[PDB]
Each structure stands twice: as structure tokens, then as C-alpha cells.
Amino acid sequence: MNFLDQLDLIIQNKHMLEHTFYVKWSKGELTKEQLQAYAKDYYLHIKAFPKYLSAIHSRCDDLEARKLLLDNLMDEENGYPNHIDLWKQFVFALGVTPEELEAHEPSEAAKAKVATFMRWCTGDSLAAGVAALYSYESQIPRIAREKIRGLTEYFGFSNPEDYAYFTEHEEADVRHAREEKALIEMLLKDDADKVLEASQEVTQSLYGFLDSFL
Amino acid sequence: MNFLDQLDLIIQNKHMLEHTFYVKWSKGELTKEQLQAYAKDYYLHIKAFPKYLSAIHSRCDDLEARKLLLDNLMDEENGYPNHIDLWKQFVFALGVTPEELEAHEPSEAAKAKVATFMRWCTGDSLAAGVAALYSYESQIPRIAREKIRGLTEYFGFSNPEDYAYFTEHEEADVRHAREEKALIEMLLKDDADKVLEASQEVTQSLYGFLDSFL
Ligand SMILES: [Fe+2]
Ligand SMILES: [Fe+2]
Ligand SMILES: [Mn+2]
Ligand SMILES: [Mn+2]
């Protein structure tokens, strides 16, 4: 049918919450040493996400589009604590030291997840760049919901500042997903095919990243 | 640095306020038909300037360096009236109709100036990117003051809200220059020569733009 509806369908069937990792999470059947490996490896992506949005904005001449992209990037980076500071917090309440986090060498699967995002956001299809982000962010409110359930049920999280990252994204990425859907429309330049192509890589590139922990 | 001092000396020796264009403006010997052309033609630059910052930002891994760039871009784009809005206000108050401005074809002089800026900010030297903007912004605080003065002298500007773009930039660009000069230092990676070359190019490209109305 319509391509946004096809876009949502690729996402529905390659959705993170169905991977074995979050299946292992939904049922507690995960380990601390695993989630510490997950939190550290994710850190490359958290630092990189503001660049994804800068990349698209830098190539955009739709003034109204840039305001919406600047809105997201403000949410991600501006002020204290930003989403990065919020992710560091989470890593630390998992028993990891600041020196262990800073020294960690990003995995091959981690550097790979970032280059797919970065490839599309610097590509030639502005609509496909957004669509790459949308493929990640549209899942995060539901993922972050179950992450909070799994963190406090099984891994002994009592202080809710520890999972403040997932609390903010429970609500933040409902807006980002919705605003990004609009952005795809606004910036479409006959590149529906690239849009769905981007969706394909990101959905998989994430599945590859989550494989690494198992 | 010594090179920071050389960068400043380039700008001094090729300063926009010494151009014959702004000379005539300082002494009020400029015609309203010319100011309309200036204002009409500057539009492309005004709209592009956010992209210069996002471009640099999108290439940068110094997390502290990105916060400062985002601060500039917020000042430029976020909210209403943003710096584009304030430029449009100034345009119309010189007697231009919105369809004229939006219907204006931008000169090759303006396209080349913007192309030089984009070249450096999408170049491979972060410091030269910043330095290219810095060679623009450090001129502006002084320019804005003289701009407003000549406006209410020889071109009769009763209402200040007409020249609000200049009243804003008379003070904001003081901070932008200063944080840019800090960015140059933080981001440097043996490209001091690039920094100096970006400056030489940008100042000449700006002088070339002012020539097309004389
Ligand atoms: Fe985020
Ligand atoms: Fe500005
Ligand atoms: Mn988001
Ligand atoms: Mn400025």
C-alpha cells in the first residue's frame, strides 16, 4: 500500500523486542556481566546520535524541517543532564567505573551499527536519513518500557535515577518518532525506495549488534 | 599560539568595515536601490549559516566542543524570531515585498561566498571549519554598530524593531567569536595552516560579495 505503512511493516517484523536478548530480558534470563557488556558497547552509539541529526540538518534547505531536526538534537544533547550524561549514569549504577567505561574499546558490531546510521544520514536522500533514525526511535518507547520492568524486577534497581535514561525515552521518543514521520513526508523527493532501503539496513544492523552479546 | 594572532591579523588587514561599500554606507552615500539588492542577496547566506554549524558539529567527536556549537546554532535557529526571521524583518522594512524576497535570484557573488563557507565546514579540518566561521563572526559586532548608526542617520530608521537583526548580532556575535576561538584551539590537530588558509579565502570571498553592488 502506502510507503509509510510499508516502512512501519519492515519495523514490525524486524523489531528489537523480539530478539533473543530482550526475550532473555523479559524473562530475567540474562546476566550482570552481559548487561555490563551491553551498556559499555552501546556507549559509542549514544555519543554518536547527535551527529546523525546534525548530518541531516547540515544538508537541508527546508527551513521548517531543520527546526524539527534541531528540536530533536536539542533533546539529545543540550543542557545537563543530556541523554549522554543519562546513559553514563546507567552504566555506573551497573557497577562499572568511569575509567572502565572511558577505556572500553567499542566492538566490531558496535562500530558497525554506527556506520549504517551514519551512512544514511550523510547519504543523498534526506528522507532516507530520517527514515534510518525513525527505524530506531519508533521502537524505543516500547523497549524502554520493558527495560524498566526488567531492571527493577530482576536486577535490583531501587533508585529510579539509575534508569532515568529509559524513563526519559519512554516519553521522548513518542515525539521523535512522530516528528520524524512528518519529516520523511516533508523531505520526500521521489526516493521512497531509499527510505525502505534505509529501514532494511538499520533494522538488521541492530539485530547484528544485539547478536554479539550471545 | 602565534597562529591565533596571525589569524586575527589576516582579518584586520582584510576587514569588511574598510570595504568601499561599508565606507559609503558609513558616510551615508549609498542608495536605497542598492540596499534592497544587498538585503535581497544576503538571504542565501542567512539561511545557510545554520548548516555551516551543523556540518562541523556532525563531524566532531569532542563532546564538549559540540555543546558550544549547538549553543551557536540554537542562537541562530531555535525559537521565534530566529536570526532568519530577524533578517526578513530588516529586508521588508527597506521596502521589499515578501514575494520579491522569495522571488529573488541570488547572485553568483553570493553563491560563491556560501560555497567557500560550505567548503571549509564540510572540509576535513574541524579547526579550519570553525576558523572560517570565526573570520566572519568576529567582524560582525563592530559592523552591526556602524550599520545601525548609518541607518538612523542617512536612511532614517525611526523604529528600532526594524533593525533588530543588527541589535541582536551587535551583542550575540561577541560571544560567538570568543567561543569559536576556543573551538579552534580545542579542535586543532596540526592544521594551523588550514586555519590560516580558510581565513584568507573567507575574507576575500566576503570582499568579493561586497563588490557586486558598486
Ligand atoms: Fe536519546
Ligand atoms: Fe546569526
Ligand atoms: Mn530520540
Ligand atoms: Mn553568530
From Swiss-Prot, chains A, B:
Location of this chain's protein in the cell: Secreted; Host cytoplasm
UniProt effect for mutating H83A: Apoptotic activity is decreased by more than 60%, but the mutant still binds to death receptors
Residue(s) at site: Side-chain cleavage: Y22
EC number of the protein: 1.3.3.-
Keyword entries, A-Z: Host cytoplasm, Iron, Metal-binding, Oxidoreductase, Secreted, Toxin, Virulence
Record-listed Fe(2+) 2 binding positions: E76, E137, D173, H176
Impact reported for Y22F: Loss of PABA synthase activity
Enzyme category, top tier: oxidoreductase
Annotated TM spans: none
Record annotation: effect of changing Y136F: Retains 90% of PABA synthase activity. Retains 80% of PABA synthase activity in the presence of iron and manganese
Protein name as annotated: 4-aminobenzoate synthase
